A and B are shown apart, each in its own frame.
Chain A
């Protein structure tokens, strides 16, 4: 008699959904002003 059970296995799949990635942590407004205008916020308002 033939064995009515096959080594063939059932298959499940992962709920892999990719949406839209996020923007990285934008620079702080103080550091933004620094490496763009070479001088901090305090040194800019003293004028």
Chain B
């Protein structure tokens, strides 16, 4: 009944680690959706400072576009 009390905290520290790595995937998904709405012929900006933000993503940093930019090119190279 001490190890149970330890797991109540270790699980909280694992859910706070799948919160900061699902944010960093939400941001790439929304950046892809922005690029795709811009390509298919719709007038919405694609700067990282103009994405939408909904507490599943947080504020967008610059490095969350670099990451995306090297990941479309990586995916297009593999087709």
Residues of chain A whose beta carbon lies under 8 Å from any beta carbon of chain B: 1-16
**B42 partner residues in chain A, CB cutoff 8 A:** 14, 16
Q: Are B51 and A12 interface neighbours, CB within 8 A?
A: yes
Return the chain B residue nearest A15 by Cβ: B43
Q: Are A9 and B22 interface neighbours, CB within 8 A?
A: no
Q: Are B52 and A1 interface neighbours, CB within 8 A?
A: no
**B53 partner residues in chain A, CB cutoff 8 A:** 10
* 12 CB < 8 A contacts A-B: A2-B15, A3-B15, A5-B22, A5-B23, A5-B26, A9-B26, A9-B29, A9-B54, A10-B51, A12-B51, A13-B44, A14-B42
Q: How far is the CA of A8 from the CA of B22 in the complex (A)?
A: 11
10 nearest interchain CB pairs? A14-B42, A10-B52, A10-B54, A1-B15, A5-B19, A12-B52, A5-B22, A1-B12, A14-B44, A14-B43
Residues of chain B whose beta carbon lies under 8 Å from any beta carbon of chain A: 11-12, 15, 18-19, 22-23, 26, 29-30, 33-34, 37, 42-44, 51-54, 56-57
Q: Are B11 and A1 interface neighbours, CB within 8 A?
A: yes
Q: Are B44 and A10 interface neighbours, CB within 8 A?
A: no
**B29 partner residues in chain A, CB cutoff 8 A:** 9
Shortest beta-carbon distance from B67 to chain A in Å:
17
